Amino acid sequence: WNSNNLDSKVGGNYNYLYRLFRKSNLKPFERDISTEIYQAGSTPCNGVE
Amino acid sequence: KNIDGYFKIYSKHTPINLVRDLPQGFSALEPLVDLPIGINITRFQTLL
């Protein structure tokens, strides 16, 4: 359902994020709460972005 | 075991008089209760 006053804040929203660039694909019936940085070739960042 | 987050426990007691080289006898294992938590397990450790 659509929420117009529950999660719609004036100062944006930073508590909800979505994974876009990480190579680790989340398989069904699984969960991953790791917050890391995507590695592009060399220099593995993993938090040293 | 852990299938779809369900925890299975198979326990059974049988009398035997031996210290090693387990015999070739046959005996089934029956469950007692199902524990439907729904989590992932990757490591285990026994207590002494």
From Swiss-Prot, chain B:
| Effect in UniProt of substituting residue 19 to E | In strain: Omicron/XBB.1.5, Omicron/EG.5.1
Glycosylation site positions: 40
- Give the result of residue 21 to G, as annotated: In strain: Beta/B.1.351
Q: Function of this protein?
A: Attaches the virion to the cell membrane by interacting with host receptor, initiating the infection. The major receptor is host ACE2. When S2/S2' has been cleaved, binding to the receptor triggers direct fusion at the cell membrane. When S2/S2' has not been cleaved, binding to the receptor results in internalization of the virus by endocytosis using host TFRC and GRM2 and leading to fusion of the virion membrane with the host endosomal membrane. Alternatively, may use NRP1/NRP2 and integrin as entry receptors.
SUBUNIT field: Binds to host ACE2. RBD also interacts with the N-linked glycan on 'Asn-90' of ACE2. Cleavage of S generates a polybasic C-terminal sequence on S1 that binds to host Neuropilin-1 (NRP1) and Neuropilin-2 (NRP2) receptors. Interacts with host integrin alpha-5/beta-1 (ITGA5:ITGB1) and with ACE2 in complex with integrin alpha-5/beta-1 (ITGA5:ITGB1). May interact via cytoplasmic c-terminus with M protein. May interact (via N-terminus) with host bilirubin and biliverdin, thereby preventing antibody binding to the SARS-CoV-2 spike NTD via an allosteric mechanism.
Q: What is this protein called?
A: Spike protein S1
List the lineage, top down. Answer: Viruses, Riboviria, Orthornavirae, Pisuviricota, Pisoniviricetes
What gene is it encoded by? S
